Symmetry: C3
Subunit: 105 residues, 3 copies
């Protein structure tokens, strides 16, 4: 069995023009003391990351601000801030409400 | 190719999670449960939707409108999910397998268990 | 690491009672040039398929229009139109908001 905690967040940003992004992050790990990892913690991490995207011109931070590339970008930074013993399992980034990218490790 | 039927249901419950060696602050939530069952498609279907929903809802019924701290030593979303999964597995017919349980405490935070 | 793009769409159909079906299609491929496949091309492929069921009595097109059989049929139609460097990874068909069939390849 695999156990993971999931957090959903959202942020806005424009590229080429100002969309709402729905982010879903799944973190895998063992259940210890009743939990994989603190919900608030993970949300703090993710929000710090998206705060750098929030209402900004992605085309300045990305050579090509595609949903796939924005997701890759986010995953790399989530991973760097994750505590030990857990791993980034999945990142789902929706640009709009029915169009998204799913990265799975 | 794998084929699964999925049922979504919800229940409400209040609880306070362990926040030191003591506890925390009682708050109420709507919990959203998603159960995925895997099986072979025979004569057009894996398992009757209603049959599964009834199994699942008999289980969530035990939690619905309850103070979870009265039922779990530490009612974290993970522990509740584990308990739900054990109960469901125990009642599934012999031709399907419990594949996944996703429990959401509200819509922004959840736990996913996969077999 | 695996990468997929996801498109969601909906259509109404009967089988006889009538329901709103919510379809989610996941396509797997390599991220190249910032993307796996353009969302619009995928959406066009999926909706060109779903339009055949929209506002129809599934019992006149399917011998046994179970959600499972519809999902299977949809998946094969999509598979036959996808570009060469991509693969149909998942089809989730919801008959209403609370019940669905997930097919994963």
């Amino acid at each position: 069995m695999k156990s993971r905690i999931i957090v959903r967040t959202s942020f806005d940003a424009a590229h080429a023009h100002g969309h709402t992004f729905f982010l879903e992050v799944a973190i895998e790990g063992e259940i210890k003391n009743g939990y994989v990892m603190d919900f608030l913690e993970l949300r703090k991490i993710v929000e710090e990351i998206t705060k750098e995207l929030d209402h900004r011109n992605l085309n300045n931070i990305f050579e090509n601000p595609t949903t796939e590339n924005i997701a890759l970008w986010i995953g790399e930074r989530i991973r760097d801030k994750l505590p030990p013993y857990v791993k980034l399992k999945r990142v789902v980034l929706w640009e709009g409400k029915d169009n998204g990218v799913e990265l799975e490790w």
